[PDB]
Design a binder for this molecule. Structure first.
Ligand code: BGC
Length: 445
């Protein structure tokens, strides 16, 4: 009953720039959409903002070393756009130097990095020009992605373009749940198109420069189950799947939007006008790997309400994390199998994020997070079963090396395998982290 993963399997840890850096108004960084969003009453639990956060901006060397000490050979992080392009075409050298030093530390500890170009922290000045709803933003992104690729790239083995296009578009401009906080479906679908194009843009910049680092986009995906055998529930569930999964994966691999969903969004697509000749061709560029983020599954039933999809999620109280998210590792296996069947069909799959937020408690200077553990272990078994059966899973990154600003949840949720004392900013590895260290040592468990 042992689970040993390939010899070449990629074991890593992942973070986000806004969630851990802090130093919001330092080194020339200008405000990002989240800096603004977090100040709007009700948008973030407790009114928390990414100000200071884990202060990684100052503790980066101790963190990267902490990673090494923990036996990690890979580290995925994102670059804060606001640190690089603080204003319309200026190129903040100070921001660039920060990441350069971060990289000096990574290479020094013997780690292999993965740079994520966009992790939701769009510069605010860009949002003032219309944000992701303006084609013009794609050019600003072209400027940004180019600067990073030129300044680096010679030492970036792995390029991660966009992290979860779905969240930035649907939640950012559609539901109002993520920055900038709009509630307009037309704007959301337009933004999703634009963000997807940027993956293709970065992909062209990657080829035009001749970089050798593997590149690819990361899509969050979730397995969808119907709440019952009722026809309308089954339909309901097809709709949710197209909403989060197929709307982004289809264009990426097949060069098109789900016909059913396109028909369902009707007037909101305004005739797909935002789609210009060449666009789809630009977006349909899988690359060398498909990054995937997974946390849970959804159980859907239909409704006849005013919402966009007229769907209702069945909230399982069963094993769940501190965020109310159900723990169903089996769905992870099914999702991965499904992914390879369509879209993926062979391409290297990489789980750029997976993990859980459990209520932590410090006892005797240690964190006995058995839960976050029953969680990572079981999902890894699901990954192991996916392999062993032919699946092309090439790696796994545990989400959140450190506890951090969990977006709308603020600091109330802890996803880290390393505990952050926010009063003193001291790092303290949790039991799950130690376990992960032994596991990576034996390359299995
Ligand atoms: O659950 C919160 C987590 O969700 C993942 O989908 C996001 O990529 C992470 O940035 C975030 O911390």
């Amino acid at each position: 009953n042992t689970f040993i993963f390939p010899a070449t399997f990629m074991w890593g840890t992942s973070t986000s720039s806004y969630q851990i850096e802090g130093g919001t108004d330092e080194g020339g960084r200008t405000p990002s959409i989240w800096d603004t969003f977090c100040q709007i009453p009700g948008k973030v639990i407790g009114g928390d903002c990414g100000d200071v956060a884990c202060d990684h901006f100052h503790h980066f060397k101790e963190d990267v070393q902490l990673m090494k000490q923990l036996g990690f050979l890979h580290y995925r992080f994102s670059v804060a756009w606001p640190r690089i392009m603080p204003a319309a075409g200026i190129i903040n050298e100070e921001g660039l130097l920060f990441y350069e030093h971060l990289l000096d530390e990574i290479e020094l500890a013997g780690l292999i990095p993965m740079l994520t170009l966009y992790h939701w922290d769009l510069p605010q000045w860009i949002e003032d020009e219309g944000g992701w709803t303006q084609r013009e933003t794609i050019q600003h992104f072209k400027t940004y992605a180019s600067v990073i690729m030129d300044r680096f790239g010679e030492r970036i083995n792995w390029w991660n373009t966009i992290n979860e296009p779905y969240c930035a578009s649907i939640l950012g401009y559609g539901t109002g749940e993520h920055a900038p906080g709009h509630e307009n479906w037309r704007e959301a679908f337009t933004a999703a198109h634009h963000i997807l194009m940027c993956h293709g843009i970065a992909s062209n910049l990657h080829k035009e420069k001749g970089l050798t680092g593997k590149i690819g986009i990361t899509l969050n995906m979730e397995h969808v189950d119907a709440a019952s055998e009722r026809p309308e529930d089954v339909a309901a569930a097809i709709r949710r799947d197209g909403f989060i999964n197929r709307w982004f994966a289809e264009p990426l691999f097949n060069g098109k939007y789900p016909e059913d969903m396109v028909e369902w969004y009707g007037t909101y697509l305004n005739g797909l006008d935002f789609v210009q000749p060449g666009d789809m061709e630009l977006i349909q560029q899988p690359g060398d790997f498909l990054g995937i983020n997974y946390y849970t599954r959804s159980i859907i039933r239909s409704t006849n309400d005013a919402s966009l999809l007229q769907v209702e999620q069945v909230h399982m109280e069963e094993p769940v994390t501190d965020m109310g998210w159900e723990i169903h590792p089996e769905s992870f296996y099914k999702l991965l199998t499904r992914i390879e069947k369509d879209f993926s069909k062979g391409l290297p799959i990489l789980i750029t994020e997976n993990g859980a937020a459990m209520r932590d408690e410090l006892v005797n200077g240690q964190i006995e997070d058995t839960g976050r553990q029953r969680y990572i272990e079981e999902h890894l078994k699901a990954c192991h079963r996916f392999i062993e059966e032919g699946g092309q899973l090439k790696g796994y990154f545990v989400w959140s090396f450190l506890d951090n600003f969990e977006w709308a949840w603020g600091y109330s949720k802890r996803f880290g395998i390393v505990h952050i004392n926010y009063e003193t900013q001291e790092r303290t590895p949790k039991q799950s982290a130690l376990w992960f260290k032994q596991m990576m040592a034996k390359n299995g468990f």
